[PDB]
Swiss-Prot record:
Main location: virion
Keyword Plastid among record annotations: no
Annotated function: Self assembles to form a helical capsid wrapping up the viral genomic DNA. The capsid displays a filamentous structure with a length of 760-1950 nm and a width of 6-8 nm. The virion assembly and budding take place at the host inner membrane.
Localization, UniProt: Virion; Host cell inner membrane
Assembly, per entry: Homomultimerizes. There are about 2,700 copies of this protein in the phage capsid.
Cysteine disulfide partners in this protein: none
Record topology, Periplasmic segments: 1-24
Protein name: Capsid protein G8P
């Protein structure tokens, strides 16, 4: 059924037009994950104990 919920959806469809926020948020994401790979890579080399 072609039901796209015209109640809250439609209203949210307007707020979702924030093309000024869909870009800088992506860079922040990398700073969340990529930020782990850094410290993570450190534990590996520092947890070798060969």
């Amino acid at each position: 059924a072609e039901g796209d919920d015209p109640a809250k959806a439609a209203f949210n469809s307007l707020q979702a037009s924030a093309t000024e926020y869909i870009g800088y948020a992506w860079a922040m994401v990398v700073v969340i994950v990529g930020a782990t790979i850094g410290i993570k890579l450190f534990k590996k080399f520092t947890s070798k104990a060969s």
